[PDB]
Protein backbone atom coordinates (compact mmCIF):
# COMPACT_ATOMS: atom_id res chain seq x y z
CA UNK A 1 0.00 0.00 0.00
CA UNK A 2 1.02 3.59 -0.78
CA UNK A 3 2.87 5.49 2.02
CA UNK A 4 1.61 8.91 3.25
CA UNK A 5 4.64 10.83 2.07
CA UNK A 6 3.71 10.01 -1.58
CA UNK A 7 0.21 11.42 -1.30
CA UNK A 8 -0.65 15.15 -1.82
CA UNK A 9 -3.51 16.14 0.61
CA UNK A 10 -6.58 17.82 -0.82
CA UNK A 11 -5.99 16.59 -4.30
CA UNK A 12 -6.45 13.45 -6.33
CA UNK A 13 -2.64 13.25 -6.70
CA UNK A 14 0.28 10.93 -6.00
CA UNK A 15 4.04 11.38 -6.61
CA UNK A 16 6.36 8.54 -7.65
CA UNK A 17 3.71 5.94 -6.71
CA UNK A 18 3.54 3.28 -9.53
CA UNK A 19 4.35 0.08 -7.52
CA UNK A 20 1.20 -0.12 -5.38
CA UNK A 21 -1.34 -0.97 -8.12
CA UNK A 22 -4.44 1.19 -8.36
CA UNK A 23 -4.21 3.76 -5.57
CA UNK A 24 -7.47 4.54 -3.85
CA UNK A 25 -8.70 7.98 -4.90
CA UNK A 26 -5.84 8.77 -7.31
CA UNK A 27 -6.92 10.54 -10.52
CA UNK A 28 -3.42 11.63 -11.74
CA UNK A 29 0.00 10.06 -11.12
CA UNK A 30 3.04 12.39 -11.23
CA UNK A 31 6.58 11.10 -11.96
CA UNK A 32 9.47 13.39 -10.90
CA UNK A 33 12.27 11.59 -12.91
CA UNK A 34 13.20 8.46 -14.78
CA UNK A 35 15.04 6.45 -11.95
CA UNK A 36 13.82 2.85 -11.25
CA UNK A 37 13.04 3.33 -7.51
CA UNK A 38 10.59 6.05 -8.71
CA UNK A 39 9.10 4.65 -11.96
CA UNK A 40 8.85 1.00 -10.64
CA UNK A 41 5.49 -0.29 -12.00
CA UNK A 42 4.98 1.62 -15.26
CA UNK A 43 4.52 -0.25 -18.66
CA UNK A 44 2.60 -0.48 -21.87
CA UNK A 45 -0.41 -1.70 -19.76
CA UNK A 46 -0.63 1.47 -17.60
CA UNK A 47 -3.88 3.38 -18.47
CA UNK A 48 -4.06 6.26 -15.96
CA UNK A 49 -2.82 9.81 -16.73
CA UNK A 50 0.95 10.34 -16.02
CA UNK A 51 2.21 13.87 -15.63
CA UNK A 52 5.92 14.55 -16.09
CA UNK A 53 8.60 16.58 -17.96
CA UNK A 54 9.08 16.36 -21.77
CA UNK A 55 12.33 14.35 -21.28
CA UNK A 56 10.76 11.93 -18.79
CA UNK A 57 7.85 11.48 -21.28
CA UNK A 58 10.29 10.58 -24.10
CA UNK A 59 11.78 7.90 -21.85
CA UNK A 60 8.34 6.48 -20.80
CA UNK A 61 7.30 6.14 -24.51
CA UNK A 62 10.58 4.67 -25.82
CA UNK A 63 12.05 2.64 -22.97
CA UNK A 64 8.95 1.37 -21.11
CA UNK A 65 6.48 1.56 -24.09
CA UNK A 66 3.86 3.50 -22.23
CA UNK A 67 1.21 4.58 -24.70
CA UNK A 68 1.26 8.20 -25.91
CA UNK A 69 -2.39 8.87 -25.05
CA UNK A 70 -1.61 8.41 -21.33
CA UNK A 71 1.60 10.60 -21.25
CA UNK A 72 1.05 14.20 -20.28
CA UNK A 73 4.30 16.22 -20.64
CA UNK A 74 4.37 19.72 -19.12
CA UNK A 75 6.73 22.60 -19.93
CA UNK A 76 8.94 23.90 -17.13
CA UNK A 77 8.52 27.19 -15.35
CA UNK A 78 4.92 27.48 -16.58
CA UNK A 79 1.67 27.63 -14.59
CA UNK A 80 -0.51 24.67 -15.72
CA UNK A 81 -3.98 23.40 -14.60
CA UNK A 82 -4.35 19.67 -13.80
CA UNK A 83 -7.78 18.32 -12.70
CA UNK A 84 -8.59 21.79 -11.53
CA UNK A 85 -5.40 22.43 -9.53
CA UNK A 86 -2.56 24.83 -10.56
CA UNK A 87 0.86 23.18 -10.75
CA UNK A 88 4.39 24.25 -11.80
CA UNK A 89 7.38 22.03 -12.68
CA UNK A 90 10.83 23.35 -11.74
CA UNK A 91 14.32 22.11 -12.55
CA UNK A 92 15.53 19.82 -9.76
CA UNK A 93 19.31 19.85 -10.71
CA UNK A 94 19.28 15.96 -10.49
CA UNK A 95 19.42 13.89 -13.74
CA UNK A 96 18.06 14.87 -17.15
CA UNK A 97 14.35 15.54 -17.07
CA UNK A 98 14.15 15.66 -13.25
CA UNK A 99 11.69 18.09 -11.71
CA UNK A 100 10.36 19.54 -8.43
CA UNK A 101 6.48 20.10 -8.35
CA UNK A 102 4.70 23.16 -6.84
CA UNK A 103 0.98 22.48 -6.04
CA UNK A 104 -1.41 25.40 -5.31
CA UNK A 105 -4.29 23.77 -3.38
CA UNK A 106 -7.83 25.13 -3.72
CA UNK A 107 -7.84 26.21 -0.01
CA UNK A 108 -4.67 28.43 -0.33
CA UNK A 109 -2.06 25.87 0.89
CA UNK A 110 1.10 25.78 -1.26
CA UNK A 111 3.15 22.48 -1.33
CA UNK A 112 6.63 21.90 -2.82
CA UNK A 113 7.68 18.30 -3.51
CA UNK A 114 11.42 18.31 -4.39
CA UNK A 115 11.53 14.87 -5.93
CA UNK A 116 15.27 13.97 -5.89
CA UNK A 117 17.32 17.26 -6.04
CA UNK A 118 20.66 18.92 -5.62
CA UNK A 119 19.88 22.29 -3.95
CA UNK A 120 21.50 25.31 -5.50
CA UNK A 121 21.24 29.10 -4.89
CA UNK A 122 19.98 29.49 -8.47
CA UNK A 123 16.67 28.04 -7.21
CA UNK A 124 16.17 31.11 -4.91
CA UNK A 125 15.32 32.94 -8.19
CA UNK A 126 12.77 30.73 -9.91
CA UNK A 127 8.94 30.94 -9.39
CA UNK A 128 9.71 29.91 -5.76
CA UNK A 129 10.66 33.37 -4.82
CA UNK A 130 7.09 34.63 -5.52
CA UNK A 131 4.96 33.04 -2.72
CA UNK A 132 5.03 31.37 0.61
CA UNK A 133 5.36 27.52 0.88
CA UNK A 134 3.50 25.81 3.71
CA UNK A 135 4.62 22.12 3.31
CA UNK A 136 7.94 20.78 1.90
CA UNK A 137 8.31 17.11 0.89
CA UNK A 138 12.12 17.03 1.05
CA UNK A 139 14.86 14.74 -0.53
CA UNK A 140 16.77 14.01 2.67
CA UNK A 141 19.25 11.51 1.14
CA UNK A 142 22.32 13.18 2.74
CA UNK A 143 20.73 14.87 5.76
CA UNK A 144 23.69 14.59 8.21
CA UNK A 145 26.68 16.90 8.58
CA UNK A 146 29.27 14.30 7.68
CA UNK A 147 28.05 14.47 4.09
CA UNK A 148 30.27 17.07 2.47
CA UNK A 149 31.29 16.83 -1.15
CA UNK A 150 32.90 19.10 -3.74
CA UNK A 151 31.05 21.01 -6.52
CA UNK A 152 30.30 19.15 -9.73
CA UNK A 153 32.64 21.65 -11.52
CA UNK A 154 35.68 20.70 -9.31
CA UNK A 155 35.01 16.98 -9.82
CA UNK A 156 34.76 17.35 -13.64
CA UNK A 157 38.03 19.47 -13.55
CA UNK A 158 39.75 16.54 -11.80
CA UNK A 159 38.46 13.91 -14.21
CA UNK A 160 39.35 15.87 -17.40
CA UNK A 161 42.88 16.69 -16.14
CA UNK A 162 43.45 13.02 -15.03
CA UNK A 163 42.23 11.50 -18.34
CA UNK A 164 44.04 14.10 -20.55
CA UNK A 165 47.34 13.48 -18.67
CA UNK A 166 47.01 9.69 -18.87
CA UNK A 167 46.26 9.44 -22.60
CA UNK A 168 48.86 12.08 -23.51
CA UNK A 169 51.52 10.02 -21.63
CA UNK A 170 50.19 6.81 -23.27
CA UNK A 171 48.20 7.18 -26.55
CA UNK A 172 47.34 3.50 -26.22
CA UNK A 173 45.40 3.89 -22.92
CA UNK A 174 41.56 3.33 -23.03
CA UNK A 175 39.32 5.39 -20.71
CA UNK A 176 36.21 3.59 -19.26
CA UNK A 177 33.30 5.21 -17.37
CA UNK A 178 30.68 3.21 -15.45
CA UNK A 179 26.92 3.87 -15.65
CA UNK A 180 23.65 2.20 -14.56
CA UNK A 181 21.00 4.81 -14.91
CA UNK A 182 20.59 8.25 -16.50
CA UNK A 183 22.41 11.08 -14.72
CA UNK A 184 26.09 12.13 -14.46
CA UNK A 185 26.44 12.32 -18.30
CA UNK A 186 28.89 15.26 -17.81
CA UNK A 187 31.57 12.81 -16.54
CA UNK A 188 31.91 10.85 -19.81
CA UNK A 189 30.98 13.76 -22.15
CA UNK A 190 33.64 16.15 -20.74
CA UNK A 191 36.40 13.48 -20.88
CA UNK A 192 35.50 12.63 -24.56
CA UNK A 193 35.48 16.42 -25.43
CA UNK A 194 39.08 16.94 -24.05
CA UNK A 195 40.41 13.84 -25.82
CA UNK A 196 38.79 14.57 -29.20
CA UNK A 197 36.79 11.32 -29.19
CA UNK A 198 33.13 10.16 -29.20
CA UNK A 199 31.83 8.05 -26.33
CA UNK A 200 31.23 4.48 -27.39
CA UNK A 201 28.44 2.47 -25.85
CA UNK A 202 25.79 -0.31 -26.32
CA UNK A 203 22.82 0.28 -28.60
CA UNK A 204 20.46 0.23 -25.51
CA UNK A 205 22.46 3.09 -23.84
CA UNK A 206 22.70 5.10 -27.09
CA UNK A 207 18.84 4.82 -27.41
CA UNK A 208 18.44 6.11 -23.82
CA UNK A 209 20.71 9.09 -24.43
CA UNK A 210 18.90 10.02 -27.68
CA UNK A 211 15.70 10.44 -25.60
CA UNK A 212 17.33 13.30 -23.55
CA UNK A 213 17.25 16.55 -25.72
CA UNK A 214 20.99 17.09 -25.08
CA UNK A 215 22.27 19.59 -27.76
CA UNK A 216 24.73 18.16 -30.24
CA UNK A 217 24.53 14.60 -28.97
CA UNK A 218 24.93 12.93 -32.36
CA UNK A 219 28.25 14.88 -32.13
CA UNK A 220 29.42 13.25 -28.81
CA UNK A 221 28.17 9.63 -28.70
CA UNK A 222 28.34 6.53 -30.91
CA UNK A 223 27.74 2.74 -31.07
CA UNK A 224 31.02 2.22 -32.97
CA UNK A 225 33.33 1.17 -30.16
CA UNK A 226 36.22 0.78 -32.60
CA UNK A 227 36.32 4.47 -33.41
CA UNK A 228 36.09 5.58 -29.70
CA UNK A 229 38.70 5.77 -26.90
CA UNK A 230 36.17 6.52 -24.20
CA UNK A 231 33.86 3.52 -23.53
CA UNK A 232 30.81 3.30 -21.30
CA UNK A 233 30.18 0.00 -19.45
CA UNK A 234 27.70 -1.14 -16.86
CA UNK A 235 28.68 -0.11 -13.38
CA UNK A 236 29.01 -3.79 -12.33
CA UNK A 237 31.83 -4.37 -14.77
CA UNK A 238 33.97 -1.57 -13.16
CA UNK A 239 36.31 -3.95 -11.28
CA UNK A 240 39.65 -5.59 -12.14
CA UNK A 241 38.13 -8.78 -13.61
CA UNK A 242 35.50 -6.93 -15.64
CA UNK A 243 38.03 -4.50 -17.05
CA UNK A 244 40.77 -7.13 -17.83
CA UNK A 245 38.09 -8.92 -19.82
CA UNK A 246 37.03 -5.82 -21.65
CA UNK A 247 40.66 -5.04 -22.60
CA UNK A 248 40.94 -8.52 -24.14
CA UNK A 249 37.98 -7.69 -26.41
CA UNK A 250 39.68 -4.63 -27.89
CA UNK A 251 42.01 -6.77 -30.02
CA UNK A 252 45.35 -5.30 -28.94
CA UNK A 253 44.33 -1.72 -29.76
CA UNK A 254 44.96 -0.76 -26.12
CA UNK A 255 47.43 -1.79 -23.40
CA UNK A 256 46.17 0.14 -20.33
CA UNK A 257 42.75 1.15 -18.80
CA UNK A 258 41.97 4.16 -16.71
CA UNK A 259 38.38 3.78 -15.29
CA UNK A 260 36.02 6.07 -13.42
CA UNK A 261 33.21 5.16 -10.96
CA UNK A 262 31.11 8.22 -10.20
CA UNK A 263 29.80 7.34 -6.70
CA UNK A 264 27.61 9.64 -4.49
CA UNK A 265 29.39 9.86 -1.08
CA UNK A 266 32.20 7.69 0.26
CA UNK A 267 33.85 8.28 3.83
CA UNK A 268 37.18 9.12 2.14
CA UNK A 269 35.41 12.62 1.86
CA UNK A 270 35.70 13.43 5.61
CA UNK A 271 39.53 13.23 5.51
CA UNK A 272 40.62 13.93 1.90
CA UNK A 273 40.19 16.77 -0.70
CA UNK A 274 39.38 16.17 -4.41
CA UNK A 275 42.92 17.16 -5.40
CA UNK A 276 44.22 14.37 -3.14
CA UNK A 277 42.13 11.44 -4.62
CA UNK A 278 44.14 8.35 -5.76
CA UNK A 279 43.11 5.24 -7.65
CA UNK A 280 43.14 1.55 -6.92
CA UNK A 281 45.62 -0.09 -9.30
CA UNK A 282 46.37 -3.67 -10.39
CA UNK A 283 48.79 -4.21 -13.23
CA UNK A 284 47.81 -1.99 -16.21
CA UNK A 285 44.34 -1.11 -14.76
CA UNK A 286 43.58 1.87 -12.48
CA UNK A 287 40.09 2.67 -10.98
CA UNK A 288 39.14 6.12 -9.59
CA UNK A 289 36.04 6.57 -7.43
CA UNK A 290 34.99 10.20 -7.84
CA UNK A 291 32.40 11.95 -5.59
CA UNK A 292 30.08 13.29 -8.28
CA UNK A 293 26.69 13.81 -6.55
CA UNK A 294 23.25 14.62 -7.94
CA UNK A 295 21.89 15.08 -4.41
CA UNK A 296 22.18 17.96 -1.99
CA UNK A 297 25.08 17.99 0.48
CA UNK A 298 24.04 18.71 4.08
CA UNK A 299 25.07 22.38 3.88
CA UNK A 300 23.33 22.86 0.49
CA UNK A 301 20.10 21.29 1.87
CA UNK A 302 20.26 23.39 5.07
CA UNK A 303 20.73 26.65 3.03
CA UNK A 304 17.71 25.88 0.84
CA UNK A 305 15.36 25.11 3.68
CA UNK A 306 16.51 28.14 5.78
CA UNK A 307 15.77 30.32 2.64
CA UNK A 308 12.36 28.74 1.89
CA UNK A 309 11.18 28.78 5.55
CA UNK A 310 8.45 26.07 5.27
CA UNK A 311 5.87 25.64 8.02
CA UNK A 312 6.18 21.82 7.95
CA UNK A 313 8.84 19.41 6.53
CA UNK A 314 8.03 15.82 5.38
CA UNK A 315 11.18 13.74 4.63
CA UNK A 316 11.02 11.39 1.65
CA UNK A 317 14.37 9.49 2.18
CA UNK A 318 15.79 7.60 5.25
CA UNK A 319 12.29 7.34 6.69
CA UNK A 320 12.45 3.64 7.56
CA UNK A 321 14.20 3.72 11.00
CA UNK A 322 13.35 5.48 14.20
CA UNK A 323 16.98 6.62 14.68
CA UNK A 324 17.14 8.18 11.19
CA UNK A 325 13.80 9.92 11.54
CA UNK A 326 14.72 11.33 15.01
CA UNK A 327 18.15 12.56 13.73
CA UNK A 328 16.47 14.36 10.77
CA UNK A 329 13.78 16.02 13.00
CA UNK A 330 16.50 17.27 15.35
CA UNK A 331 18.34 19.02 12.44
CA UNK A 332 15.10 20.56 11.14
CA UNK A 333 14.52 22.11 14.59
CA UNK A 334 18.07 23.48 14.75
CA UNK A 335 17.68 25.05 11.32
CA UNK A 336 14.43 26.72 12.28
CA UNK A 337 15.83 28.11 15.58
CA UNK A 338 19.03 29.39 14.01
CA UNK A 339 17.08 31.15 11.17
CA UNK A 340 14.18 32.46 13.31
CA UNK A 341 11.15 31.11 11.36
NI1 LIG B 1 17.01 9.73 -8.40
UniProtKB/Swiss-Prot annotation:
Belongs to the DNA repair metallo-beta-lactamase (DRMBL) family. Binds constitutively to TP53BP1. Binds CDC27, which is itself a component of the anaphase promoting complex (APC). Binds PIAS1. Expressed in brain, heart, kidney, liver, pancreas, placenta and skeletal muscle. May be required for DNA interstrand cross-link repair. Also required for checkpoint mediated cell cycle arrest in early prophase in response to mitotic spindle poisons. Possesses beta-lactamase activity, catalyzing the hydrolysis of penicillin G and nitrocefin. Exhibits no activity towards other beta-lactam antibiotic classes including cephalosporins (cefotaxime) and carbapenems (imipenem). This is DNA cross-link repair 1A protein. Induction: During mitosis. The mRNA encoding this protein contains an internal ribosome entry site (IRES) in its 5'-UTR. This 5'-UTR generally suppresses translation while specifically promoting expression during mitosis, when cap-dependent translation may be impaired. It is found in: Nucleus.
